[PDB]
């Protein structure tokens, strides 16, 4: 049910995904820009839920704080996710 994934953010390029909070206050990958960083690395897919970012719980963060945290982060990044299924 829970998966650990990793990706590399070594430039100033955006991740190229959009996030939304749903009714359970869960952080959901809503759209993925084709050709963008996440799309190329295959790290996340639409409907996946992000639980943690580098071991940092998403639950006690606002959407702005998450956006700022992700924009500024660099290097090897680990997500704990709840994957969606086709």
């Amino acid at each position: 049910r829970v998966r650990l994934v990793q990706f590399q953010k070594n430039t100033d390029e955006p991740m190229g995904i959009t996030l939304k909070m749903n009714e359970l206050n869960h952080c959901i990958v809503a759209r993925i820009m084709h050709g963008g960083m996440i799309h190329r690395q295959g790290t996340l897919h639409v409907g996946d839920e992000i639980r943690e970012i580098n071991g940092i719980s998403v639950a006690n963060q606002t959407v702005e704080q998450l956006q700022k945290m992700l924009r500024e982060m660099r290097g090897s990044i680990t997500f704990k996710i709840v994957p969606s299924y086709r």
Partner: peptide, 5 residues
Amino acid sequence: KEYYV
């Protein structure tokens, strides 16, 4: 609302 990262 949606948020870009």
